[PDB]
Design a binder for this molecule. Sequence first.
Ligand SMILES: *[C@@H]1O[C@H](CO)[C@@H](O[C@@H]2O[C@H](CO)[C@@H](O)[C@H](O)[C@H]2NC(C)=O)[C@H](O)[C@H]1NC(C)=O
Ligand SMILES: *[C@@H]1O[C@H](CO)[C@@H](O)[C@H](O)[C@H]1NC(C)=O
Ligand SMILES: *[C@@H]1O[C@H](CO)[C@@H](O)[C@H](O)[C@H]1NC(C)=O
Ligand SMILES: *[C@@H]1O[C@H](CO)[C@@H](O)[C@H](O)[C@H]1NC(C)=O
Ligand SMILES: *[C@@H]1O[C@H](CO)[C@@H](O)[C@H](O)[C@H]1NC(C)=O
Lengths: 31, 605
Amino acid sequence: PVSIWLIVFGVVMGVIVVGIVILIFTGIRDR
Amino acid sequence: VLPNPGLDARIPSLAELETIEQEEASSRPKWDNKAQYMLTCLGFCVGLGNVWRFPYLCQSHGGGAFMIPFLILLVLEGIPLLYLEFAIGQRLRRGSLGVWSSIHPALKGLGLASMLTSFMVGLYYNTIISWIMWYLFNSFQEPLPWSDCPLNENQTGYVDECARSSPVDYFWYRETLNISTSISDSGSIQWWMLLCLACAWSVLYMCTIRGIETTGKAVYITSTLPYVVLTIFLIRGLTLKGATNGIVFLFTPNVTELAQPDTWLDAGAQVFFSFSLAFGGLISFSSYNSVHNNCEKDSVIVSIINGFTSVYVAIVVYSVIGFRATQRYDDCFSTNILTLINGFDLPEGNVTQENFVDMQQRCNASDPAAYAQLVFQTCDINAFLSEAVEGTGLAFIVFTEAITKMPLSPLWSVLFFIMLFCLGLSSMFGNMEGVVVPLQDLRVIPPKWPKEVLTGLICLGTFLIGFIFTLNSGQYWLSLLDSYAGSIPLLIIAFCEMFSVVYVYGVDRFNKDIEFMIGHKPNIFWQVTWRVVSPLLMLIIFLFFFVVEVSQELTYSIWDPGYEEFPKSQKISYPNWVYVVVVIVAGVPSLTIPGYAIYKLIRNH
Ligand SMILES: *[C@@H]1O[C@H](CO)[C@@H](O[C@@H]2O[C@H](CO)[C@@H](O)[C@H](O)[C@H]2NC(C)=O)[C@H](O)[C@H]1NC(C)=O
Ligand SMILES: *[C@@H]1O[C@H](CO)[C@@H](O)[C@H](O)[C@H]1NC(C)=O
Ligand SMILES: *[C@@H]1O[C@H](CO)[C@@H](O)[C@H](O)[C@H]1NC(C)=O
Ligand SMILES: *[C@@H]1O[C@H](CO)[C@@H](O)[C@H](O)[C@H]1NC(C)=O
Ligand SMILES: *[C@@H]1O[C@H](CO)[C@@H](O)[C@H](O)[C@H]1NC(C)=O
């Protein structure tokens, strides 16, 4: 009922964009 | 030896090099450890070609012996080249395009040929990682989606092409790719694949954001993990049913295959891809080291681990092929048992494998005209071990079928697809280093706009060109470019690096400068292979290319489900407009090396 390959995509695509955000953040910061 | 003037006051000088590193601590990145540099160089040599390209060529070309060929060619092309590439970046202190423009600035095409080659290899290798993480998302469920056929509309029979083919062969061509019947017929963008592509490029932009001070920890993990998993697959692979029957089949020597012009080409063109030579990334990674770093000991350690790993992955791969071929031989031979039991009324455990042939003739001597309707199979090993699958099918229709017949199916599939992911990732780091650093020495953007902004426009710009391989015919496009591209550019760029250091820079200036870094001017073995052996040995690989290109009858494989005698193979002879694509991807990286050299010599004079 959930299309199980979508929710594993979701918890992976969640980590990467918050992994990127913090990245650019600290970047410009110590920049 | 070639008379170029003004070599000094264009490169740094030898007495000035002891002061240049206490000022390039700013405005130039630097490694933290020595192991941070060796782990990002092993990840650039080992990836995705030791899995589905080398163990096929190790066997198909008289395995057990091909080892011999692959070896010699190694300590002859590979060693010398890698060494000369490591020692040229440490000295001239620039990237790839800055080194060849420092020595005779009318040359400059080796930097632009390495950038065009790194753009095209990293464009389609980020679609293979897009396919790999699609199979990783479809794990974490105990009935795997490539384990059984779906029902159609009335729930009475299977889907028609899942029954004639295999269910795994159905998950690739219809539920992953949705492939078409030709390269001419293309459709829509196929959303799921697109989402996956996005994910791949995003995961790549997070790891290579701030140049080299991110791909450090990255390399660490993305370089060890692959090794540990590969190991875990050895003590599981050598235990199942039919390993040591697929290891022996890999190492059977056939000495007739040594006397072939096609053997030594792909054994030669694998060495330039077992390493990462003529790509322009190993010069930019070596240019961050200290000036007195030993680059002679690094090129031997890197090449020993690369020659040991390629044998080590072939042991792991052919243990799984040996398990799948023993299983298919037993689920074939048990159906030849089941036919006569259903026709001659014999007990259950009656007529096993030890007594097949004698119980064939006991029945036909008992009563004739009842054996004539019996359909038996002629299945035998060395016919189940001998399929010629290569390039993507060794992971998506061969390796993942043997995983479903193991004990814990959704755990050996998560461990298998995170490993491939890691390999892909390290190779990606390499190619990205290859396209960003020559795009800074060209100065396409102002000296504002920091390192986050240039990498973000490469990861977004190569994403939109990657829409070609998400179409319905997107797998015929990816099988086209690969080979060609790689091969040609690699060989050509690799020859002019060995030429323009020995005969344009000067191998006598080179020796002195090397000695200044390490001491002990290199041996007679280094002087022989640099001067005479490896430039000569790289010409007969270039001569064998135009021998095997003019007679192989260039074709490609399609799927075509609505076709008479369907699940065998197909070759249908590429259209005439595809030579435009072959000339573009293989010719213009090869022709910018003379093309800029003709332009610069007629702009001055
Ligand atoms: C060892 O390698 C040779 C080299 O190709 C294989 O040889 C050929 O066999 C085919 C039969 O299908 C002939 O059409 C070719 O002309 C043969 N080539 C030569 C050069 O004679 C041979 O099959 C390999 N050995 C085994 C056991 O497979
Ligand atoms: C199969 O399904 C179709 C509708 O998709 C239906 O018309 C047909 O009667 C079904 N066949 C059987 C044998 O039930
Ligand atoms: C691709 O899949 C869609 C449904 O997802 C289907 O309508 C279409 O026919 C498929 N393409 C081909 C070439 O069969
Ligand atoms: C198969 O049947 C024959 C016929 O009686 C019998 O002698 C033999 O023991 C049987 N084999 C097994 C494994 O039971
Ligand atoms: C029974 O069939 C086999 C298969 O063709 C044949 O070789 C054999 O000779 C037959 N037996 C007799 C008695 O003809």
